[PDB]
Design an enzyme around this catalytic site. Structure first.
Site, PDB file in Angstrom:
ATOM      1  N   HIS A 192     -27.181 -41.997 -33.449  1.00  0.00           N
ATOM      2  CA  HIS A 192     -28.412 -42.323 -31.773  1.00  0.00           C
ATOM      3  C   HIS A 192     -29.058 -43.181 -32.751  1.00  0.00           C
ATOM      4  O   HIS A 192     -28.757 -43.253 -33.798  1.00  0.00           O
ATOM      5  CB  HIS A 192     -29.338 -40.369 -32.246  1.00  0.00           C
TER       6      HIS A 192
HETATM    7  C1  LIG Z   1     -36.796 -48.575 -38.420  1.00  0.00           C
HETATM    8  C2  LIG Z   1     -36.687 -47.134 -38.060  1.00  0.00           C
HETATM    9  C3  LIG Z   1     -35.328 -47.327 -37.508  1.00  0.00           C
HETATM   10  C4  LIG Z   1     -34.453 -45.884 -37.537  1.00  0.00           C
HETATM   11  N1  LIG Z   1     -33.760 -46.037 -37.088  1.00  0.00           N
HETATM   12  C5  LIG Z   1     -32.993 -44.973 -37.004  1.00  0.00           C
HETATM   13  C6  LIG Z   1     -31.608 -44.825 -36.228  1.00  0.00           C
HETATM   14  O1  LIG Z   1     -30.980 -45.744 -35.239  1.00  0.00           O
HETATM   15  N2  LIG Z   1     -30.806 -43.252 -35.927  1.00  0.00           N
HETATM   16  C7  LIG Z   1     -31.292 -42.648 -36.943  1.00  0.00           C
HETATM   17  O2  LIG Z   1     -30.583 -41.354 -36.612  1.00  0.00           O
HETATM   18  N3  LIG Z   1     -32.684 -42.578 -37.495  1.00  0.00           N
HETATM   19  C8  LIG Z   1     -33.409 -43.314 -37.110  1.00  0.00           C
HETATM   20  N4  LIG Z   1     -34.434 -43.204 -37.941  1.00  0.00           N
HETATM   21  C9  LIG Z   1     -35.259 -41.956 -38.643  1.00  0.00           C
HETATM   22  C10 LIG Z   1     -36.009 -40.979 -37.945  1.00  0.00           C
HETATM   23  O3  LIG Z   1     -36.481 -41.991 -37.224  1.00  0.00           O
HETATM   24  C11 LIG Z   1     -35.966 -40.317 -38.920  1.00  0.00           C
HETATM   25  O4  LIG Z   1     -34.876 -39.979 -39.622  1.00  0.00           O
HETATM   26  C12 LIG Z   1     -36.547 -39.161 -37.577  1.00  0.00           C
HETATM   27  O5  LIG Z   1     -37.948 -39.481 -36.990  1.00  0.00           O
HETATM   28  C13 LIG Z   1     -37.311 -37.755 -38.613  1.00  0.00           C
HETATM   29  O6  LIG Z   1     -37.505 -36.997 -38.206  1.00  0.00           O
HETATM   30  P1  LIG Z   1     -38.754 -35.776 -38.569  1.00  0.00           P
HETATM   31  O7  LIG Z   1     -39.019 -34.433 -37.039  1.00  0.00           O
HETATM   32  O8  LIG Z   1     -38.752 -35.595 -40.092  1.00  0.00           O
HETATM   33  O9  LIG Z   1     -40.004 -36.776 -38.095  1.00  0.00           O
HETATM   34  P2  LIG Z   1     -40.455 -37.905 -37.513  1.00  0.00           P
HETATM   35  O10 LIG Z   1     -39.936 -38.119 -36.593  1.00  0.00           O
HETATM   36  O11 LIG Z   1     -41.110 -38.856 -37.852  1.00  0.00           O
HETATM   37  O12 LIG Z   1     -42.000 -37.077 -36.603  1.00  0.00           O
HETATM   38  C14 LIG Z   1     -42.648 -37.074 -37.892  1.00  0.00           C
HETATM   39  C15 LIG Z   1     -44.475 -36.528 -37.030  1.00  0.00           C
HETATM   40  O13 LIG Z   1     -45.405 -35.740 -37.426  1.00  0.00           O
HETATM   41  C16 LIG Z   1     -46.178 -36.425 -37.683  1.00  0.00           C
HETATM   42  N5  LIG Z   1     -47.791 -36.684 -39.249  1.00  0.00           N
HETATM   43  C17 LIG Z   1     -47.430 -37.030 -39.846  1.00  0.00           C
HETATM   44  N6  LIG Z   1     -48.739 -36.185 -40.929  1.00  0.00           N
HETATM   45  C18 LIG Z   1     -49.114 -35.438 -40.070  1.00  0.00           C
HETATM   46  C19 LIG Z   1     -50.203 -34.065 -39.684  1.00  0.00           C
HETATM   47  N7  LIG Z   1     -51.057 -33.845 -41.097  1.00  0.00           N
HETATM   48  N8  LIG Z   1     -50.703 -33.221 -38.990  1.00  0.00           N
HETATM   49  C20 LIG Z   1     -49.742 -34.142 -37.731  1.00  0.00           C
HETATM   50  N9  LIG Z   1     -48.619 -34.592 -37.566  1.00  0.00           N
HETATM   51  C21 LIG Z   1     -48.448 -35.317 -38.249  1.00  0.00           C
HETATM   52  C22 LIG Z   1     -46.148 -38.174 -37.007  1.00  0.00           C
HETATM   53  O14 LIG Z   1     -47.324 -38.619 -35.829  1.00  0.00           O
HETATM   54  C23 LIG Z   1     -45.070 -38.275 -36.562  1.00  0.00           C
HETATM   55  O15 LIG Z   1     -45.207 -38.299 -35.087  1.00  0.00           O
HETATM   56  C24 LIG Z   1     -35.529 -44.881 -38.287  1.00  0.00           C
HETATM   57  C25 LIG Z   1     -36.444 -44.754 -39.130  1.00  0.00           C
HETATM   58  C26 LIG Z   1     -37.031 -46.269 -38.565  1.00  0.00           C
HETATM   59  C27 LIG Z   1     -38.577 -45.902 -39.282  1.00  0.00           C
END
Ligand SMILES: Cc1cc2nc3c(=O)[nH]c(=O)nc-3n(C[C@H](O)[C@H](O)[C@H](O)COP(=O)(O)OP(=O)(O)OC[C@H]3O[C@@H](n4cnc5c(N)ncnc54)[C@H](O)[C@@H]3O)c2cc1C
Ligand SMILES: Cc1cc2nc3c(=O)[nH]c(=O)nc-3n(C[C@H](O)[C@H](O)[C@H](O)COP(=O)(O)OP(=O)(O)OC[C@H]3O[C@@H](n4cnc5c(N)ncnc54)[C@H](O)[C@@H]3O)c2cc1C
Ligand SMILES: CN1CCN(C(=O)Nc2ccc(F)cc2)CC1
Ligand SMILES: [Br-]
Ligand SMILES: [Mg+2]
Ligand SMILES: [Mg+2]
EC number: 1.8.1.12
Lengths: 483, 486
Positions: free
Chosen positions: A459
């Site tokens: 992705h």
């Molecule tokens: C610049 C960049 C580029 C990337 N490019 C890619 C890519 O091309 N392909 C890929 O597979 N991955 C990519 N990633 C990684 C990807 O974004 C993450 O692996 C993924 O979003 C992690 O998902 P998650 O479910 O762990 O949390 P996230 O998607 O990070 O969701 C976490 C959420 O929790 C919320 N939150 C945090 N603390 C609290 C709280 N106390 N109470 C309520 N809400 C809270 C935040 O607001 C956020 O919306 C990239 C990351 C970055 C930073």
């Protein structure tokens, strides 16, 4: 001179067979072709149709045609330049393509010098007898003898040739062969045919046409690209139209005359008329057996004019084989190459191998392009009691920004719903030919839909659609489509 | 106020778990996030890091960046125009990216309202007790309680956050978070880090820089993109250099000061200096565990700071799970998604399933890009007695014509040479991320090298390279690299 193997046609299949025979099985090998480098008068040459007037030059010219879209689409991502300064210089494209093809011609020349027991002979190969290939000056069998080649084994690998309808004014029309050598890009062009060659050239001409130019594609049936997935046929029709190509379906040329200014006056069967600069006939390709004098040895031909072969590429005459388009099965370079290898492994390796003509990944370099492997649903639905179709169709985000909102990516998986086995995968959109290759490997491994949807996506990509489809969009039950 | 599942973080992992639970198992679900749409102050929002400040916007911006190469490369195919008229309008790109991300934010809003038993709560989630999530107004545990959520099951999915090195003048520096909202493209920029975010952003800045601009990438060690194939690491380094990016290896900022004109004076540990308009730190992301008050119910963290989980995403505390970047393993959106779907099928669907963290296809949207799946040869060579490497590296014909002769396409297959099993596939070149996806399926099916070489090529493609390699280029035997087997 005496050879273990004489190959008539130095093309995709013929060069694979010859090289493998010589280098892998240490056989003494002769190869015959009518031309050492690309272009008029015989078009195909050392390297084959693909190298000279097929896959290689056409892909370069589609790559060129794609910049028309990139330049326009760049604006949505903030790119600014003087639109009115933009010219598509066709002469430069043709010169670049010509140098690329000649470089391949020359390297094949060098391959024949540097490869002991692999000899090239120039001219027209035909069968004098079942162990003798005669090379002559011209395709005319009365022409001067250049060589007589004693052959333990003879491989027919002369490929195919454009089909031209016997209509009045056929002589004012060209095929793909001449299209590669047009000195100027046509202002108005009619591509005749709904197959990949008509569609790919319609995209090429559409990008390079001079100002106020127009590309028209006509097809005798209702929907272009018969043999391809029906959703893809409809979408590629829409996406061609949205880029300014006129698709005339249920239309076919009845005759061609020259207007006074030397343009072509096209009369369709429907009575309709069209004035164009070029009429490119792409209505089919037929096996090239006319010149081979196969009557001299009694090699069985089909009514079509293809060499009849068993699964091991054997003619009815032992020691005479045929591979590639001359066999009129799948007209693809990798299949010809595969047939060539399997034959030499069988004949000289006692390692008997037949080419699998099922689940062959292929592409159309339309704009946007198609990648496909295996069965379309309508076909699967006759050979299987229950068929599932998993379908994803949507404008990718980048094309909402690009302004090409018409560019729906189509991803479709067809399964035997009884056990989940993937029968077909059909893609339309940027990257589709690149996505589908490793899908060919999946289908060879009897991949099920569960193997796709349990794989973690990459992705963001178009390809991850293939690994995100859990639930059928619809079914075929005993040939009948069900929601 | 009572829910089958409370999810903290409405991100890649959290929304997949939330939605699946509600729509597949008619379960009652609360999802918490700090913001309903992208950007300052909290950057991540409804949709999560990928949607708001990650994969999605990054990919649009790399796509924008690629037009620098297309515009130049078009000339070899006969395209003519006024090169002197070409401008890259960063503000247009950012406004387009913002509109695209906002629509996804709104798309998720619609999802919550439409879906029965799926409720969104705005504010900061923390653990009060085993079965109670409290939503507060700020990250401060002392701020007002907007809600108290009773939970049969709690999912921690709060993702990660850029690490900012504690150097003098770090307040002059940005993360990827701020990079997405720069009002102007930097003329001079230092991307700090050797990982995918620094590499991708160097590419973006390189295309959008105003005239006389310069992109510098620094990395504290010798070779960028640790954990990728070594051939690809070396090639990306060359191909970025060939496109005007300066790669400073064995270099690391020691401090930053504002010059009087607003620009940044960077001092390296080596004592070297550099003036740039922007210092973007991309040296790592760290799990967002602080604000959850894990110390209140004793959820165990690892020596690395991420939430400890078993194969089923279970913490030491029953009914409390953790998926995605907070677990500090593979920080990828599709892994987070897979973990969430598996957790919900285990816990609510009575269909236990564990995420496979092996043979995960991933990409770097470097220009040109990387696509990879499974083991690099150095890692394979330590696990397997005999490893074969099949390698094809060449400038594709079209890049001889484009003038980008430096764009060597790399296709490498790493096998277990004892049985031909493909252990890893590594691609560098246009289309690599697209080529690699179906390779992920091949590796799940235990594809051998002979499964690749016996498959008929699609011609002409880069991808057919993978079906054209029959003979190892070299081997590892008991960990030792050698041209030929004994
Ligand atoms: C610049 C960049 C580029 C990337 N490019 C890619 C890519 O091309 N392909 C890929 O597979 N991955 C990519 N990633 C990684 C990807 O974004 C993450 O692996 C993924 O979003 C992690 O998902 P998650 O479910 O762990 O949390 P996230 O998607 O990070 O969701 C976490 C959420 O929790 C919320 N939150 C945090 N603390 C609290 C709280 N106390 N109470 C309520 N809400 C809270 C935040 O607001 C956020 O919306 C990239 C990351 C970055 C930073
Ligand atoms: C416009 C076009 C585009 C195509 N695009 C693709 C594509 O993208 N991908 C793909 O896989 N396939 C493509 N094909 C099909 C592909 O070119 C053929 O399937 C393939 O070249 C056939 O290989 P072959 O060995 O059968 O014969 P060929 O490669 O055609 O070789 C036959 C050779 O025999 C020579 N010859 C003929 N008669 C004689 C004689 N009597 N004596 C001596 N030599 C003789 C010819 O000069 C020629 O070199 C395309 C075809 C065309 C026309
Ligand atoms: C099977 N592959 C085919 C592509 N390939 C290659 O090198 N192509 C090439 C590029 C440019 C040029 F000028 C000539 C050939 C590697 C082997
Ligand atoms: Br039809
Ligand atoms: Mg020789
Ligand atoms: Mg709701």
């Amino acid at each position: 001179k005496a050879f273990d193997l004489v190959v008539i046609g130095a093309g995709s299949g013929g060069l694979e067979a010859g090289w493998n025979a010589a280098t892998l099985y240490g056989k003494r090998v002769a190869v015959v072709d009518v031309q050492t480098s690309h272009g008029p008068p015989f078009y195909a040459a050392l390297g084959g149709t693909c190298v000279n007037v097929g896959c290689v030059p056409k892909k370069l010219m589609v790559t060129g045609a794609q910049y028309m879209d990139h330049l326009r689409e760049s604006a949505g991502f903030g790119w600014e330049f003087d639109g009115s300064s933009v010219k598509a210089n066709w002469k430069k494209l043709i010169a670049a393509k010509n140098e690329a093809v000649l470089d391949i011609n020359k390297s094949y020349e060098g391959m024949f010098n540097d490869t002991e027991g692999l000899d090239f002979f120039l001219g027209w190969g035909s069968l004098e007898s079942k162990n003798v290939v005669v090379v002559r000056e011209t395709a005319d069998p009365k022409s001067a003898v250049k060589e007589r080649l004693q052959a333990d084994h003879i491989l027919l690998a002369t490929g195919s040739w454009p089909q031209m309808p016997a209509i009045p004014g056929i002589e004012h029309c060209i095929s793909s062969n001449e299209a590669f050598y047009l000195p100027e890009p046509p202002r108005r062009v009619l591509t005749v045919g709904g197959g990949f060659i008509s569609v790919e050239f319609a995209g090429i001409f559409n990008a390079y046409k001079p100002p106020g130019g127009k590309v028209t594609l006509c097809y005798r049936n209702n929907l272009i690209l018969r043999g391809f997935d029906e959703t893809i046929r409809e979408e590629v029709t829409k996406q061609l139209t949205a880029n300014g190509i006129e698709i005339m379906t249920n239309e076919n040329p009845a005759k061609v005359s020259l207007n006074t200014d030397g343009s072509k006056h096209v009369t369709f069967e429907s009575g309709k008329t069209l004035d164009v600069d070029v009429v490119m006939m792409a209505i089919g390709r037929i096996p090239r057996t006319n010149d081979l004098q196969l009557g001299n040895v009694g090699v069985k031909l089909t009514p079509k004019g293809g060499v009849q072969v068993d699964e091991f590429s054997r003619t009815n005459v032992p020691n005479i084989y045929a591979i590639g388009d001359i066999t009129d099965r799948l007209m693809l370079t990798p299949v010809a190459i595969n047939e060539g290898a399997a034959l030499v492994d069988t004949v000289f390796g006692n390692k008997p191998r037949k080419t699998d003509h099922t689940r062959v990944a292929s592409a159309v370099f339309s704009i946007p392009p198609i990648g496909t492997c295996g069965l379309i649903e309508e076909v699967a639905a006759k050979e299987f009691e229950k068929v599932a179709v998993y379908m994803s169709s949507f404008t990718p985000l980048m094309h909402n920004i690009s302004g090409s909102k018409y560019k729906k990516f189509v991803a479709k998986i067809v399964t035997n719903h009884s056990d989940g086995t993937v029968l077909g995968v059909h893609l339309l959109g940027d990257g589709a030919p690149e996505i589908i290759q490793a899908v060919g490997v999946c289908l060879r491994l009897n991949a099920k839909i569960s193997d796709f949807y349990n794989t973690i996506g990459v992705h963001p990509t178009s390809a991850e659609e293939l690994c995100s489809m859990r639930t059928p969009s619809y079914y075929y039950v005993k040939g009948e489509k069900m929601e």
